[PDB]
Amino acid sequence: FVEMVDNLRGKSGQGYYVEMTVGSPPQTLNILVDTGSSNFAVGAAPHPFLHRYYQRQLSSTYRDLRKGVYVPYTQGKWEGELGTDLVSIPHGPNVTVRANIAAITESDKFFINGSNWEGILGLAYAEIARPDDSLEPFFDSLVKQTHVPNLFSLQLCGAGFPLNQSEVLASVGGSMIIGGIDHSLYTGSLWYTPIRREWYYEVIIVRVEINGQDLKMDCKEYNYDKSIVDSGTTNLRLPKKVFEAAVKSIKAASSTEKFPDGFWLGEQLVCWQAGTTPWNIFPVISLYLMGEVTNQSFRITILPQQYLRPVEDVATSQDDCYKFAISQSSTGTVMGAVIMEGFYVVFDRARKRIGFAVSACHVHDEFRTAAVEGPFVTLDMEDCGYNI
């Protein structure tokens, strides 16, 4: 398992990527890790934003399905050619497997400059694959073709201040452990919440509190229409009613200071003389998630450092500058990277639950700690889940 520690690199802004090799002989590539999609896909053709790409011509083993696919993401989109080839992770477990790959030909707004990741890995379930479930998402392949246990665990570590793409290469952000939990990673005790439906890593959120204040919205409200855990997404996204709720609540705590109401949307960043940033104004939000026991639940708490995100200088002077990491959503809540940076998150597919624990690499506020705590009592939790 040590073999796999620290494999990951990246930031919330541009995603965390892992190194994989595809085809025979193997071609090295860096792939985005996404739990928001179940589709494995890569660049097979030259692009401005791409250092390297998949050339099937060289793979001896590249196999072709004579099919075409199109993939939709709230932000990017791409369409490509389905094929299968041998695939491996150097810094993963010591195995190689043949899995469906899509060679991307046309893309919109998928690739990111200096992201340094030329591919995407969707670790979500089949139902959401494209074109249809039939196509087997990669991890399933791995499990099927090997003795890898059916779980993976993700620790995502996030920088103090903006990191350059060149800097990111030097920089390391995370560890992804496959078919495993590595205890060194985390502290305290994992707390697990069920996976409501095996498509996105959907979850039910029962209570929300900011600085101990309960929004006291209807619990369905939080999960409308769903709450899913996504490393795909940079920012924590909340349904409109919920989002507006926090924002009012957050603003109050922070009222003392002037932020362009533009900031709250998160279009534009706010700058503070380096090291003077007043966190204290900022609230800590507790999300309470379903227990694995009757009428039980637990909560995880977010420091602002979590949802307020560092971005680099707008001027050739240094004032720590930050952006607002919380985004309105009309597709239900998404617990994105910023949320997942705090904690060692385990996707226990086998036991169909996801477990959260405090990340070893957790950012510091002398006075407050991100933590995961249990157990709690919540009543009629199910009523919280959403049904049309």
Binding site: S12, Q14, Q75, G232, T233, T234, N235
Partner: peptide, 4 residues
């Protein structure tokens, strides 16, 4: 950002 990234939106996957």
């Amino acid at each position: 950002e990234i939106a996957x």
